[PDB]
């Protein structure tokens, strides 16, 4: 249903510039329809090309940028997938993945892994942390997909996946004014610029903590052989009820009852138990996904003050302590931070 | 005011009172002089305890 | 590093948490007190627990801003609502 | 082969405990990552000892 | 600081308590001089054990 602004708003049938694949399915992603995997009929003289794994992912076209370029690709760098390219078909969109796993390499979806092989787990955390490192401090991001990043992973690699996210370039005009929203060529800048917002300290902290929670949710998903309900961004779903069901950390009320979760291998204990109120505020920050443009309601949210300011600062510092102990738990380094 | 030191000792007694506050020697002398002015006397630290 | 600070943090946390509640070992108290001593931010507690040795000496009388400082120091190791009654 | 260090650790532990041999910090981190890969719960010099 | 060698020894004693620490000879006479200084007694390694 598309119309023009002339004296007759004509109904336009959404044109289909690409045969939509009828056999839509990915065995690595059985629960996902938009996820489709497939192995091409490579030149059969060469057994090597047999390994080439190809996965297309479906998604809306809004996720493309002003340049018609999909947002996660901006954060992509030194990618591991053998190749990638975008696919625009009307509102729908597709994103095919060329991969060539080595003679024995075998990827698999991060979801529901449970995997306790901290070597592979650390491979994935390195991939995701380096990827999100491409984010700028005054640039921020939300993930309308879920509260984590999808990916697959083999013993040799951890291939990232396309994400339903939205870039948002905030701008903190430092009092000492000595990347700008008006980066076009001067003529074009005369008309318009990025749909920027007002950056500030609190927004920086909010986005940083948000990406950190994304990291931790992905880590959970990796070490959860059961459902990791944290991903769920359902409108009806509320974190209040979520932690009411899950309860709080037995070892300390402050944190969540993540000690009792179901783990593919060794349970780590109350290690996976983050403070609760920080998670709550994180979910509130995440709710931004539905109205990204209205930034005043979510930009500083994780770092906002509910004295209330003292409690917010203290509990954010508690979450920072949690990140410190987490990094120590995996021998990590905050140079990415 | 001349017994404000004594009053602050009262405030300390109000607290857990399981640990006598420690006071400088001049503070002790002023405390003794003030209590002697109040009672209008001899007095010593044991009476203060 | 003279003392691996992770176990010091953890021991201090768990001991003070159980004390607030109302299994441990003397070496655990040693690690917690050295955790304290290393933490430059907790000198008020240094002197509190130093005085507490032997007789109960004196809880220092502190400006309320320093009271908030020590209360935040405690809450960091847990945060939960607290008061001077619990810390005493 | 990547755990040659633990080879010698267990060899020395045979019969006498000897002591905990000193080691350079970079080697400490690498061996900690090795044990990590071999585990789970956070580790350090004390746990490996 | 002078007795920080004995300090590391009593820190290592927190371990499995089956280890026997090892140290070079000059480190040994440094430890012995330190303990003799603190004791102001001669002293020997059996005392260290």
UniProtKB/Swiss-Prot annotation, chain A:
Its main location: virion. It comes from the Viruses. InterPro entries: Baculo_VP1054 (IPR008416). The keyword Transmembrane helix does not apply. Keywords: Virion. It holds the Pfam family Baculo_VP1054. The keyword Amino-acid biosynthesis does not apply. GO terms for cellular component: virion component. It is found in: Virion. Structural protein that participates in nucleocapsid assembly. Plays an essential role in the proper localization of the major capsid protein VP39, and the minor capsid protein 38K into the capsid assembly site. Interacts with C42 and VP80. Interacts with protein 38K. This is Protein AC54. It comes from Autographa californica nuclear polyhedrosis virus (AcMNPV). The gene is AC54.
Curated annotation (Swiss-Prot), chains B, E:
Transmembrane segments: none annotated. It comes from the Viruses. It is found in: Host nucleus; Virion. Forms a complex with proteins E27 and p78/83. The interaction with p78/83 mediates nuclear translocation of P78/83. Interacts with protein Ac102. Interacts with IE0. Plays a role in host nuclear actin polymerization by recruiting p78/73 protein that is capable of activating an actin-related protein 2/3 complex to initiate nuclear actin polymerization. Belongs to the baculoviridae C42 protein family. This is Protein C42. It comes from Autographa californica nuclear polyhedrosis virus. The chain holds residues 156 to 207 of 361 of the full protein.
């Amino acid at each position: 249903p598309i119309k023009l602004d002339l004296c007759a708003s004509v109904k336009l049938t959404p044109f289909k510039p690409m045969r939509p694949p009828k056999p839509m399915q990915c065995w690595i992603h059985p629960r996902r329809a938009n996820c489709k995997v497939t192995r091409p009929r490579n030149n059969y003289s060469d057994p090597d090309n047999e390994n080439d794994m190809l996965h297309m992912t479906v998604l809306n076209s809004v996720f493309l940028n002003e340049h018609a370029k999909l947002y996660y690709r901006h954060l992509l760098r030194n990618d591991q997938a053998e190749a990638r390219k975008t696919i625009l078909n009307a509102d729908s969109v597709y994103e095919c993945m060329l991969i060539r796993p080595i003679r024995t390499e075998h990827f698999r979806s991060v979801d529901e892994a449970g995997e306790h092989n901290m070597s592979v787990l650390k491979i994935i955390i390195d991939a995701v942390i380096k990827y999100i490192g491409k984010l700028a401090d005054d640039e921020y991001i939300l993930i309308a997909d879920r509260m984590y990043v999808d990916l697959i992973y083999s013993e040799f690699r951890a291939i990232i996946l396309p994400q339903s996210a939205y870039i948002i370039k905030g701008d903190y005009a430092e009092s000492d004014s000595e990347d700008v929203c008006n980066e076009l060529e001067y003529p074009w800048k005369l008309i318009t610029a990025n749909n920027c917002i007002v950056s500030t300290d609190e927004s920086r902290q909010s986005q940083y903590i948000y990406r950190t929670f994304l990291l931790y949710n992905t880590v959970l998903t990796a070490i959860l052989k059961q459902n990791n309900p944290f991903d769920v961004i359902a409108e009806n779903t509320s974190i209040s009820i979520i932690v009411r069901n899950l309860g709080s950390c037995p070892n300390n009320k402050d944190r969540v009852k993540c000690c009792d979760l179901n783990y593919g291998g060794v349970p780590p204990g109350h290690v996976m138990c983050p403070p609760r109120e920080i998670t709550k505020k994180f979910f509130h920050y995440a709710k931004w996904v539905r109205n990204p443009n209205k930034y005043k309601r979510y930009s500083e949210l994780i770092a906002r003050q509910s004295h209330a300011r003292d409690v917010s600062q203290l509990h954010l510092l508690d979450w920072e302590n949690f990140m410190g102990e987490f990094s120590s738990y995996f021998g990590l380094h905050a140079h990415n931070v | 005011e001349k017994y404000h030191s004594l009053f602050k000792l009262l405030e300390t007694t109000f607290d857990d009172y399981t640990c006598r506050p420690q006071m400088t020697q001049v503070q002790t002398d002023t405390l003794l002089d003030a209590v002697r002015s109040l009672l209008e006397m001899t007095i010593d630290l044991t009476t203060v305890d | 590093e003279l003392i691996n600070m992770r176990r010091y943090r953890n021991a201090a946390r768990k001991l003070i948490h159980h004390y607030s509640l109302n299994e441990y070992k003397i070496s655990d108290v040693v690690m917690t007190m050295i955790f304290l001593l290393r933490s430059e931010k907790y000198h008020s507690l240094f002197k509190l627990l130093e005085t507490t040795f032997d007789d109960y000496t004196c809880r220092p009388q502190m400006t309320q801003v320093q009271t908030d400082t020590l209360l935040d120091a405690v809450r960091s190791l847990l945060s939960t609502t607290i008061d001077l009654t619990t810390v005493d």
